[PDB]
Subunit: 237 residues, 4 copies
């Protein structure tokens, strides 16, 4: 309650937060430099210790932040991310070596402007889950159908549920859907177009109508809010 | 009127609807498993009977639902779909074997959240039919023109009205329209671009303007509705 | 003033307009049939005379419509289109043979629902001309630059102002812009990306912002209109 | 203060501005003509002097405009652009020879309608910088990760941070992302899809949600503005 407040003033200080951001930017520059074989041959020794130093400092920081925030730390998504991103970077030296770079997203955690962007962007998602679920069910059914219609003759694209899922996603982005998949398919299965065209219609119609519904429903609420404000004034005056 | 109500309380019960959804999810898992040759070699016998069982249960369910809803059953699109999807799965064991998977969309029929999504999405369509008709006429005219401009020299892409329709749809999605179709066409017909560019302009302009019109007209009605509410208050107070 | 009204009641009659639409649909079916070599071998004789008949009837119709509408006929875009589309089909039997199919768009001229769609869609265009002009100037400048940067070494894609225009349009649709054009270009000109990336940014930013501006400005006017209505009520009550 | 006003009436005159636009259009036509080797063989001599003449006139114009506007000239973006675009064209005769064409954008500087378009389009950008920054950080992190996951085995696409940036941008436009990059990658790295799919989801989700937020926030302000106007009337009457 006394040594506590000492470190709480540190962890909460403007300097503390600025320092950590400084390190994030430095280490971010460093991780781009470590991309050059030339650079690594000359200064790899320096950059590697600086990475260990930065992660040590970040470890101390996370530790301090937990002593200060106590339980609230692990009920906070931004610090949960800081935690797991620094924890990943702690596992001893193979894909984890690459996931270490995710600690640069810490620059989103630390900068309030960036948090508001991400929070704002994330906020459409909860209301989209049922549509996403519906779409995932749609993909699943069509992936099953495509696996068994086309998998024997086109193993790479449809031989497996996973592969059909992948290909169906490719068709959704419209990437080479016709020259690359459906025309080749139609040389064996001339009615393949009866499968993929409707698939393309549904998947594109749903995406567009999802955007239309977000905008139009947003404004419906905007209208409800100003309607109450105007009516209250009328009711009051 | 008495044995009727006995089964009506069953068919209307929370348990009845939950049970059927349970089966849909189980059978949905099962149909993904039947995709693995390995899995089928080991447990194909089990999964096949479970499919026959599920379809038997679904047959009993449809039958019960018709006795309970009487005529209203066949005037209801969700149960019409349940009907035809279960009926398909009833035809004896080849493409129908694959259409059996459509009974997984029954998970949309049974889950009210999913119905509202689909109903919502479908509701733009009635007001789009005339535009869709106009676009289909557009495709038809340009498919006729392309068949006779390019079909002799490019049979695969334009030799037939059907093939030209297909290719025109591909050009609409912009998939390989230039490297894959129009540049090859222009090596024989250097003015082919005078055909496909304007085609691309119209088809893209119409899609975008359709989205713009749905959003803007939706808000026009939103504005009309709150205008009347505010004015009525003014008129009343 | 007397024989005039006789034909005016004809030309204005519900039957007259329905008959012509009937012919348009029939001849539209016919023009799709004439696409099949098989069909032409058997019934080409019949279809060809029916085409001459239909065009004769359409010629009489246009003539009647001009006597009835007088000058107003040539000040009306829908009848101007009917005129030129029937006139094209009148030139004696080579690309004009294919333009004959454009008389099927007459089904848009004759059906009021279709006219409203087309009128509605066309109505955004006048306010877009300056943006279109700006974009065309943009294409022109970049086509000049690309012709002289890349035309010697890549004649097919940039050897000519016209070809560079074509390729630039292809890059705008994002069709094979990188694997098909810019990566090949970068093997000779490693900074080609400094040309096409910014080009892609501008062209995509302008299209999106054009859509955003149409929607948002539409609603600005919608808001101005209901604001005046509400305020007038407040002012009146 | 006296010879000053003499040239100020010139530089501000309707004729002065029209003359310069005339030259811009002429020189714009000329620069398209200089694209034809045939044309240059015959009239290249003429066009080259006309280019030197035009640039001399533009130099005099810029000089006059600076004497008239004094400091205000270099605090004005449109004239700053005129300045640098004419200055580029002044460097003696290699890429600068091509940048000379940028003086045609002077037609945007000189035509007020075009300025309003460009100003309008630019006005969304300041509020987008933080999102753009967030997206650039996103690209940077994923470019680092992709360089080290895939660069050794796929040097052309990922061997270098710059190349990975380029490829990631290509994946964002969805151009050949699967047939051209990720399927080839997956033949060596079967989990490459775990990298690029989520990358595609984020990058597409962010773009769409950025458009949704611009439209919806624009209308929020539109609603706030008319709400105050209506309420003030209610408050006043
Ligand atoms: C709303 C629900 C949507 C959820 C969709 C979930 C998508 C699951 C994709 C799993 C893909 C697995 C990857 C893959 O293809 O591996 C191959 C195995 C069989 O190949 P193999 O054994 O090597 O022969 O492939 C398989 O056999 C895997 C089959 C697993 C089926 C379980 C799917 C979850 C059930 C979804 C709920 C259905 C409700 C109707
Ligand atoms: C607004 C709606 C937007 C659309 C969202 C719904 C569309 C679903 C998109 C899913 C597309 C990605 C699926 C995919 O590519 O992987 C399939 C996996 C198994 O892959 P796998 O068997 O390992 O084979 C991959 C290729 N190979 C053979 C070379 C290794 O099998 C799976 O794991 C299936 C994963 C499905 C989960 C989808 C979750 C939605 C994302 C939020
Ligand atoms: C509720 C959402 C539903 C969405 C609708 C999507 C479902 C439609 C999928 C049907 C498309 C079939 C595409 C296709 O080509 O499948 C492959 C089969 C293979 O037989 P086939 O092509 O005749 O030749 C085999 C060649 N061989 C001997 C060398 C192997 O080819 C055929 O069997 C061709 C048979 C024509 C199928 C026509 C189906 C019309 C629509 C069916 C669904 C309507 C009820 C919803
Ligand atoms: C708003 C109206 C839009 C409706 C558009 C309907 C589109 C119809 C597509 C039918 C495509 C048939 C597939 C195909 O290409 O088969 C080949 C045959 C001839 O080939 P073949 O006999 O093997 O030599 O191809 C043909 O010869 C079929 C020709 C059938 C023409 C009938 C089209 C319906 C009339 C549309 C109303 C026109 C109003 C102006
Ligand atoms: C907002 C507007 C969105 C755009 C909607 C209008 C665009 C129309 C899209 C139609 C594109 C699909 C047409 C198509 O690919 O099939 C053409 C069929 C005959 O095909 P087919 O002769 O069997 O040849 C297919 C390829 N082959 C030779 C290898 C078998 O011939 C036909 O059956 C023509 C079907 C036209 C009906 C379109 C109905 C609109 C969908 C709602
Ligand atoms: C807002 C204004 C935008 C207007 C843009 C108009 C676009 C004009 C495209 C014309 C393309 C002609 C097609 C082509 O490439 O033919 C090749 C000839 C030279 O090749 P060749 O003589 O065979 O050697 O190519 C040429 O040499 C044709 C050069 C003609 C230049 C005239 C362009 C109109 C002036 C635009 C106003 C500029 C204002 C700054
Ligand atoms: C919201 C804004 C949307 C974007 C609108 C502005 C973008 C401009 C799009 C123009 C793209 C089409 C231009 C084009 O591909 O043709 C270029 C022509 C000369 O072509 P040409 O020299 O005959 O060569 C074509 C290929 N070849 C060698 C095999 C024959 O040279 C020309 O004639 C230039 C035509 C420019 C006029 C554009 C008018 C705007 C359309 C409204
Ligand atoms: C107002 C809107 C303006 C929009 C900006 C668009 C204008 C930028 C275009 C510059 C991009 C240049 C792309 C390019 O690779 O051009 C080709 C030249 C060719 O020389 P190079 O690539 O060095 O090698 C030639 C190879 N050889 C000997 C076998 C022929 O390659 C080079 O010369 C490379 C030189 C680097 C150019 C860097 C330009 C930075 C931006 C310049 C414009 C800024 C002022 C607006
Ligand atoms: C919000 C921040 C986003 C800013 C992103 C800036 C993107 C920088 C791209 C620079 C790409 C340089 C082009 C390139 O690949 O050249 C190769 C060299 C190494 O190759 P080499 O030396 O030939 O072996 O490649 C390199 O080694 C260059 C590495 C330079 C790293 C400096 C990046 C700026 C720091 C960004 C701030 C990070 C904050 C977390
Ligand atoms: C709403 C958000 C929209 C998305 C915006 C964020 C996405 C970032 C887009 C950047 C994509 C372009 C990057 C790029 O292609 O060049 C990478 C450069 C170095 O290139 P370089 O090493 O020369 O290699 C190019 C290919 N090569 C080997 C044949 C020469 O390395 C760099 O210089 C990196 C440049 C990053 C700056 C991005 C600034 C945002 C634009 C506003
Ligand atoms: C109704 C549709 C899909 C069809 C369906 O029925 N679900 C889905 C798409 C995503 C959801 C939006 C976002 O969540 C953001 C925001 C949340 C607010 O709370 C309410 C307003 C708004 C705009 C939501 C309305 C939108 O329409 C939802 C309900
Ligand atoms: C007018 C245009 C196309 C041009 C034309 O004239 N048709 C078409 C596109 C699809 C139609 C919309 C949807 O139906 C959904 C909804 C139905 C309501 O009832 C009225 C509002 C709303 C938004 C409709 C207005 C939209 O604008 C329609 C009339
Ligand atoms: C302002 C922008 C582009 C930027 C610029 O400054 N021009 C352009 C894009 C096309 C134009 C719209 C359409 O014409 C349809 C309609 C006409 C009405 O009369 C006014 C409203 C509306 C929505 C117009 C406003 C839109 O914003 C215009 C002015
Ligand atoms: C909030 C988002 C992104 C998420 C975030 O939090 N930033 C970004 C995207 C670009 C910005 C818009 C443009 O600047 C144009 C205009 C400027 C006005 O001043 C306010 C209104 C408007 C429409 C801005 C609101 C929009 O929403 C901003 C704040």
């Amino acid at each position: 309650s006394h040594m506590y407040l000492r470190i709480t003033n540190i962890v909460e200080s403007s300097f503390f937060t600025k320092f950590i951001i400084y390190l994030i930017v430095l280490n971010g520059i460093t991780m781009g430099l470590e991309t050059s074989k030339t650079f690594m041959q000359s200064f790899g020794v320096y950059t590697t210790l600086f990475n260990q130093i930065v992660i040590t400092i970040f470890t101390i920081e996370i530790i301090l932040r937990i002593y200060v925030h106590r339980i609230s730390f692990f009920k906070d998504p931004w610090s949960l991310f800081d935690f797991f991103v620094v924890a990943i970077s702690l596992v001893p030296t193979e894909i984890l070596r690459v996931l270490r770079v995710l600690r640069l997203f810490r620059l989103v955690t630390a900068v309030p402007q960036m948090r508001k962007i991400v929070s704002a962007l994330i906020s459409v998602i909860p209301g989209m889950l049922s549509v996403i679920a519906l779409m995932t069910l749609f993909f699943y059914i069509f992936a099953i159908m495509a696996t068994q219609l086309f998998g024997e003759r086109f193993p790479e694209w449809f031989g497996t549920l996973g592969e059909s899922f992948y290909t169906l996603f490719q068709v959704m982005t419209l990437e080479s859907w016709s020259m690359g998949i459906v025309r080749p398919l139609m040389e064996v299965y001339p009615y393949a177009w009866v499968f993929f065209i409707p698939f393309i219609f549904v998947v594109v119609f749903v995406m567009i109508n999802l955007v239309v519904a977000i905008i139009v429903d947003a404004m419906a609420i905007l209208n409800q809010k100003e309607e109450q404000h105007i009516i209250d004034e009328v009711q009051s005056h």
